[PDB]
Amino acid sequence: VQLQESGPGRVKPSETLSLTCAVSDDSFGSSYFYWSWIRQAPGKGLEWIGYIAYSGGVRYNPSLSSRVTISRNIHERQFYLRLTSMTAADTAVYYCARHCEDDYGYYSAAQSYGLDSWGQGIAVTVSPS
Amino acid sequence: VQLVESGGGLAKPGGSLRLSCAASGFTFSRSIMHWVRQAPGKGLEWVSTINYAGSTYYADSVRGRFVISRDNSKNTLSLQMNSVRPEDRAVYHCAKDKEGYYSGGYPLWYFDLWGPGTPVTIS
Amino acid sequence: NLWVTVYYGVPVWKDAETTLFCASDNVWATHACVPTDPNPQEIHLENVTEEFNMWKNNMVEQMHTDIISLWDQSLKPCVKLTPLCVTLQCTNVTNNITDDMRGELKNCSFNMTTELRDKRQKVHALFYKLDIVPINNTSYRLINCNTAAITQACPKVSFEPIPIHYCAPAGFAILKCKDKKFNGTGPCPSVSTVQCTHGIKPVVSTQLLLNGSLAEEEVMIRSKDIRNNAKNILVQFNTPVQINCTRPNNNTRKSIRIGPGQWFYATGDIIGDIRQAHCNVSKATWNETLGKVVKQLRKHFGNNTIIRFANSSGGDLEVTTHSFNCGGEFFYCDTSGLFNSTWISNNDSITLPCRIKQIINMWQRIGQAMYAPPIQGVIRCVSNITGLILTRDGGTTETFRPSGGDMRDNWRSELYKYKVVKIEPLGVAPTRCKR
Amino acid sequence: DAETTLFCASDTHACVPTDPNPQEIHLENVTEEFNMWK
Amino acid sequence: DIQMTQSPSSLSASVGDRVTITCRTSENVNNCLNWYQQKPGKAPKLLIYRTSTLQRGVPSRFSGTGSGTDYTLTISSLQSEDFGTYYCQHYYGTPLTFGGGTMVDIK
Amino acid sequence: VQLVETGGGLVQPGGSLKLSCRASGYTFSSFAMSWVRQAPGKGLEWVSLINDRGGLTFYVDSVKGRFTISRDNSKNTLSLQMHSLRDGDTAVYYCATGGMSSALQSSKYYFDFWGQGALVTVS
Amino acid sequence: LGFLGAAGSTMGAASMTLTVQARNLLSTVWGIKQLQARVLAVERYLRDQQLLGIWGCSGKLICCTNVPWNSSWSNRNLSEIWDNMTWLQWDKEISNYTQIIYGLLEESQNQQEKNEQDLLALD
Amino acid sequence: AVFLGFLGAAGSTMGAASMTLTVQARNLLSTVWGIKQLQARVLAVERYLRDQQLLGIWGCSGKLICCTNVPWNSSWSNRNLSEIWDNMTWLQWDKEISNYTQIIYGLLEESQNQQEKNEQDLLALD
Amino acid sequence: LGFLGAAGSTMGAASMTLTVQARNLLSVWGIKQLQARVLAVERYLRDQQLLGIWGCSGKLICCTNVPWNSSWSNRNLSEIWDNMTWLQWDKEISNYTQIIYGLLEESQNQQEKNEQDLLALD
Amino acid sequence: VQMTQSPSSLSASVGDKVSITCRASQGIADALAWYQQKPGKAPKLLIYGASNLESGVPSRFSGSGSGTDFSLTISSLQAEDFAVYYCQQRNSHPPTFGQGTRVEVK
Ligand SMILES: *[C@@H]1O[C@H](CO)[C@@H](O[C@@H]2O[C@H](CO)[C@@H](O[C@@H]3O[C@H](CO)[C@@H](O)[C@H](O[C@H]4O[C@H](CO)[C@@H](O)[C@H](O)[C@@H]4O)[C@@H]3O)[C@H](O)[C@H]2NC(C)=O)[C@H](O)[C@H]1NC(C)=O
Ligand SMILES: *[C@@H]1O[C@H](CO)[C@@H](O[C@@H]2O[C@H](CO)[C@@H](O)[C@H](O)[C@H]2NC(C)=O)[C@H](O)[C@H]1NC(C)=O
Ligand SMILES: *[C@@H]1O[C@H](CO)[C@@H](O)[C@H](O)[C@H]1NC(C)=O
Ligand SMILES: *[C@@H]1O[C@H](CO)[C@@H](O)[C@H](O)[C@H]1NC(C)=O
Ligand SMILES: *[C@@H]1O[C@H](CO)[C@@H](O)[C@H](O)[C@H]1NC(C)=O
Ligand SMILES: *[C@@H]1O[C@H](CO)[C@@H](O)[C@H](O)[C@H]1NC(C)=O
Ligand SMILES: *[C@@H]1O[C@H](CO)[C@@H](O)[C@H](O)[C@H]1NC(C)=O
Ligand SMILES: *[C@@H]1O[C@H](CO)[C@@H](O)[C@H](O)[C@H]1NC(C)=O
Ligand SMILES: *[C@@H]1O[C@H](CO)[C@@H](O)[C@H](O)[C@H]1NC(C)=O
Ligand SMILES: *[C@@H]1O[C@H](CO)[C@@H](O)[C@H](O)[C@H]1NC(C)=O
Ligand SMILES: *[C@@H]1O[C@H](CO)[C@@H](O)[C@H](O)[C@H]1NC(C)=O
Ligand SMILES: *[C@@H]1O[C@H](CO)[C@@H](O)[C@H](O)[C@H]1NC(C)=O
Ligand SMILES: *[C@@H]1O[C@H](CO)[C@@H](O)[C@H](O)[C@H]1NC(C)=O
Ligand SMILES: *[C@@H]1O[C@H](CO)[C@@H](O)[C@H](O)[C@H]1NC(C)=O
Ligand SMILES: *[C@@H]1O[C@H](CO)[C@@H](O)[C@H](O)[C@H]1NC(C)=O
Ligand SMILES: *[C@@H]1O[C@H](CO)[C@@H](O)[C@H](O)[C@H]1NC(C)=O
Ligand SMILES: *[C@@H]1O[C@H](CO)[C@@H](O)[C@H](O)[C@H]1NC(C)=O
Ligand SMILES: *[C@@H]1O[C@H](CO)[C@@H](O)[C@H](O)[C@H]1NC(C)=O
Ligand SMILES: *[C@@H]1O[C@H](CO)[C@@H](O)[C@H](O)[C@H]1NC(C)=O
């Protein structure tokens, strides 16, 4: 449910953006869930950055996969995005989100395939000052 | 496949009335038959039913006063309405129950076939 | 003029999900299982074609649940390590360490309650860097020490997989697909009835499927939707690739008392020089096996498509590396030496460095962790690589990478040929027989 | 009259899922003695 | 990467009007499409988690359908709150992508 | 279909004969078999019936305590053992096929194949 | 052929192996599951035996009834059921009509039939 | 539904209620929390089998209505057939005859089927 | 007299107490009783299933059409029913029990029921 | 169980899609039927089981609902469908009917 983004709102050019998304409902330790990072540049639609699966594996957007690191800490109920070599083109609101792929009915209650939970987002601006 | 009511009419606040109902197109020996009444200010109300084995069921408001009976040899359903009271004014309809899964004669109360109905006035 | 005739005992069944039990000839509690039938009855069903779906097989979810339940019942009575969650004063181990092992082990001292509950004593142990997290400086804490309940496994309860046969209640039957080319879904024209499944070893590994069954004719590529690059591909080998894994350190163990009747099993010290754990595979055998996998991959993705293997893109340590349990010692091997090739449409060995850690989080649960006690001496395992868990990048060249993490795929890779049905022996049919 | 262990229908895990059927069978001409305190 | 063309790019509507929004994918997504409504300043809210299956908590006025590469979202009777940018998103493999977005303004 | 009787044809009164019949051109075990007798100057008379399996045998009352009908489905052979033959038993005996069917088959209450009846004289 | 060996056989051939399937209907972690498996096997066996009892088929694997076959349930002839179809295909064909047939077996026999035997054994 | 009509005839006369014997028959069979459910399921099974065993012992196996060779004793009930079958329900009858139920069951075993089966053993003998 | 009271009696005399033994087959400290109850039920049902498939359902004494083979036991009736107990008999023919059961299954049900199935038409 | 049916004064054209709904005071699963009564005529049963249509009734009528919330949908309200419709439960005795919805022609 509650997904809480936390981290710097400022990165200088060529530095690394590091955001944490805290999960409050213990679903972080459950199967068939995917924990995604998505960014929306002002005036644009939304760009999926990547996700970490319940299994611990990750998938990245091919345009960003050389720069994006996604990791998690199950016990602390947090997942992390570390995006290297930040430039002006990376200014965007960075959101964390969650979806489920319970294709065979594992859960007793239906889960949503779409991003049924989003955080508030951190607007990240790249600027030397 | 029709039900045609007869009898009814006007009766005193403490008199009696007989209602009749003739069946035409179905087998009047395997059917559960029910009297249902519609009062001008209340809507449809179930009154009584008789199953194919001759067992009867009554609504609480009419139990002890009404007698429901059937005669298979005449394809006829009838109701003996004793001690009729002002609250008994209604159009009385005979109805046949949809046949479903064997229940040992227990009615379903889904009224598959209805008759035009006969008016009953108490005064 | 036909009449209804009732027949009881007709060979009719429908798909079902029921409770399956265990037979066997320890963590998995195989001593609680019924004995197996010394002469199993596999009954071929001629002219019976059944529809199978390995990705909708409820036996995989039931097995996964049973494996977790067995894991927990085997840890519930074991020693808790809550008292160990203290500040550690750790320094680097330098004694007879090669360059590959520098910084991997730390000599950590801490204040532990002695056998009496009033007095405290200073004790020390060696820890792997993967189990030690800085507090802020030489002051360290155990990884996830304050966010999870670390339970010490009982040293007397073995982690060695023992084949588990799954048996169906009377009135139910397990149907097996005998079609050697069965790809996991669809009709199987050659079906047999089995009371129970063959012995499935609960081998827990990632990336590489160790031990277990082999393909009968050709390497099998099985995926829920081969055109969906978000799904896993299970590769079943025809022949095994042997992998020789070792922990070349003559380790000692110390027993540090926690409380009455219970000890913490510490890593002690290492006799002789300290070298890194590693796994070897034959280079020629591995290359041949990948050539077979590529030949089978170039059936779905095109004959003129370049097939490339690469290492894991990231994520949890259990997924980025090949994780496995070798004699109770948990190995995390770097498989980038195995998945590093480009296959064009046109003796030696591979050594995989491995790291060792004692605090693991199996099943990726919140608030629970297990501490693997040290095993003394030198560890050596020889395993059969019987298959792979691969993913495709998707987004002329198709890049494949190792994956894993979800253990249901490991069981699914064994349960793919079985389905549970229920018997419906009571039927009716017209005959000329009247009562 | 009898005392027996009852099970729970619902729609916890100690109960049965999928809810009970609301349907009831009327017992015509059956008068039954009840005691809510026993 | 699966590309999406979403149409209309901008739609003006009054309260009570029927609103239809269409997404066209470059490749078949096997009914793995979700619809979202993003109000300015907020994260997109999920409306439909399948092509037609409505997200719990979303009013019944929203519905959708489609197959292959042709998918639609329908608002049976537009209300005063149903304004903002609507998006389609496929989860058929990776990368996950969103459509350009259709802004629903007030006539 | 070919049906050939291979039995004898001359016995003294009070003696006993066994008439075998071979069959080919159809599955023997799928059909019931009958024996039908025709006296030299008379019409046809049904004598016995055996089902397709051989467990059920039926006889005409005039022979019920004297004749035994049996069938071997492995050798495709039908036979009739006739003890205490009477002068009234002189006849041609046809090992006709049919006369009954199993409950899982259509009703074969007719004789569809006949052939080469054996002539038995009692004298 | 062993358990379910006749599953691919025609209904006729499969009806001679009913005992093969009948014999196989009765016979913390891994303890509880074993007990649940045993209880479930017993309950399902008895549910089928209860139905056989209600239909007057207790103690029999092949039971003939007094319920005629309705051509709306299936209009196939016997040669297209017993000789050219399996029981799995038949079960697929008779699905929507299984509860109707069971209700008729319950009502038309072993209820009306037992009252009739109760009266016949009276004289 | 299998539940439909269950006990509907409970207030009906014994004769009329004897036409519903399959309706009340078909509904008889179907952690500590888990143990409590298993005990309830096992008990339903045990009660079903005990009643079926009694029917077997009396020679009434597989029957809903079973005629016997035990004469009715007027000391158990001196009512005539109209009073019992047309003017009384089964609950009222059970209340009247429960004091004699074990005597009747004892006779059903001792006075007939043990003798009937031993005699049938000798009639199929000849 | 009583449960197993006839155990030391001859087979003939002991055959008169079949209901005495039959009625006693159906009827920490929590799971043991549940398993004991389930075991009693499964054993009861296996014996009832055998009686059913032999055409002996609902009977304690059941006559069959399976002839007795002198290879199973060559004793006459006097030495079985009058001069022997059931424990001795059970011991004497245990080696042939499954053979007899197979024959009972084959001729007392599979053949007999198809014959009855055919006699109900003719 | 008391049944409340609404709206009681529905009006529509001969080509409109209409929906008549009702509420049970208690949940009744799917133990509900819908009836059609023409003035001076016998009521006709349209739907039983909440979602099941009777033989002789065109596909124009459809039922939906469960528990306490039930409805009757007419995809095209032809001239022969202007009648009083009734909601009836048979989940618990006695049977009860709603007050009825009288569909009028604008
Ligand atoms: C896949 O299959 C291979 C094929 O065998 C399997 O390798 C075997 O693993 C077992 C388990 O560790 C090895 O057995 C051990 O061998 C060492 C060396 O001698 C012994 O010291 C061990 O004994 C200790 O542990 C026992 C635990 O029960 C105690 O009982 C005992 O007292 C000792 O404390 C133990 O016997 C075996 O040598 C290998 N075999 C080979 C050929 O390598 C592998 O484990 C399988 N992998 C998986 C994940 O299932
Ligand atoms: C409930 O009791 C009534 C009253 O006795 C039963 O009906 C009467 O008796 C028989 C039928 O049982 C009929 O001949 C009478 O005409 C009935 N009279 C009246 C006033 O009902 C009825 O059968 C019983 N119903 C059930 C279900 O037990
Ligand atoms: C670790 O430190 C302790 C200090 O008490 C020392 O006794 C021990 O020898 C050390 N071991 C290693 C391997 O450095
Ligand atoms: C590996 O596979 C071979 C196949 O011939 C088999 O003989 C051997 O036992 C297997 N070894 C292990 C450890 O599974
Ligand atoms: C197996 O092959 C069939 C071939 O028609 C295909 O339709 C199906 O999707 C495949 N299933 C897999 C790869 O799981
Ligand atoms: C792996 O191969 C190397 C080759 O130099 C050898 O030294 C080492 O002992 C081998 N180890 C194992 C575990 O096979
Ligand atoms: C593994 O070790 C065995 C001896 O234990 C050896 O024969 C085999 O060649 C080794 N395999 C590999 C791949 O190193
Ligand atoms: C994969 O290989 C690259 C080098 O090509 C390396 O930088 C990366 O860290 C490796 N990842 C893993 C998980 O081994
Ligand atoms: C991958 O292979 C190349 C040669 O093709 C080699 O130079 C490189 O070191 C390899 N990388 C790994 C991680 O094995
Ligand atoms: C470890 O060292 C000790 C030294 O006492 C020796 O006795 C033992 O054999 C060694 N074990 C191994 C596995 O090398
Ligand atoms: C399968 O069909 C063949 C004929 O196609 C038949 O001979 C065989 O008996 C059948 N198998 C079974 C088990 O009935
Ligand atoms: C049974 O019906 C089928 C279908 O018309 C027909 O082909 C076949 O000849 C019939 N067989 C018999 C024995 O009537
Ligand atoms: C039952 O009816 C449905 C249509 O309502 C049909 O699709 C199905 O095949 C029928 N079941 C059979 C024929 O077994
Ligand atoms: C009837 O029962 C009485 C005791 O209640 C007994 O004395 C009498 O002998 C019995 N008579 C018959 C005929 O059973
Ligand atoms: C039965 O006894 C009652 C007494 O309650 C009597 O009125 C009735 O006439 C008797 N009927 C018969 C048939 O004996
Ligand atoms: C049954 O016996 C009890 C005494 O044990 C007596 O009080 C009661 O009145 C009797 N009831 C009947 C119906 O005979
Ligand atoms: C015990 O044996 C004696 C001597 O043969 C006999 O008289 C008596 O009836 C027997 N009793 C039982 C219970 O077998
Ligand atoms: C009796 O059994 C023997 C073997 O024990 C067998 O050879 C013989 O044929 C059997 N005879 C009969 C009549 O069953
Ligand atoms: C049966 O055999 C025994 C031999 O032990 C003999 O003594 C006895 O008299 C025989 N019984 C009969 C009735 O012939």
Numbering used by the authors:
A (entry chain Q): 2 to 35, 35A, 35B, 36 to 82, 82A, 82B, 82C, 83 to 100, ...
B (entry chain H): 2 to 82, 82A, 82B, 82C, 83 to 100, 100A, 100B, 100C, ...
C (entry chain D): 33 to 57, 67 to 141, 150 to 185, 188 to 309, 312 to 321, 321A, 322 to 398, 411 to 459, ...
D (entry chain A): 47 to 57, 71 to 97
E (entry chain R): 1 to 107
F (entry chain K): 2 to 52, 52A, 53 to 82, 82A, 82B, 82C, 83 to 100, 100A, ...
G (entry chain I): 520 to 546, 569 to 664
H (entry chain B): 517 to 546, 569 to 664
Please share text taken word for word from the publication where this structure appeared.
Accordingly, we generated the E275K substitution and the resulting trimer, BG505 SOSIP.v4.1 GT1.1, referred to as GT1.1, was expressed successfully in mammalian cells.
Negative-stain electron microscopy (NS-EM) experiments confirmed that nAbs 21N13 and 12C11 targeted the CD4bs, and revealed that 21M20 bound at the gp120/gp41 interface near the fusion peptide We determined high resolution cryo-EM structures of GT1.1 in complex with nAbs 21M20 and 21N13, as well as GT1.1 in complex with nAb 12C11. Both structures also included base-binding mAb RM20A3 to help with particle orientation. The 21N13 HC contributes most of the buried surface area (BSA) (1138 Å2 versus 218 Å2 by the LC). While genetically most distant from 1–18, 21N13 targets a highly similar epitope with a similar approach angle. Furthermore, 21N13 uses CDRL3 Y91LC, which is identical to the Y91LC found in the shortened CDRL3 of VRC01-class bnAbs, to contact N279Env, while it employs T94LC that is also found in 1–18 and 8ANC131 to contact N280Env.
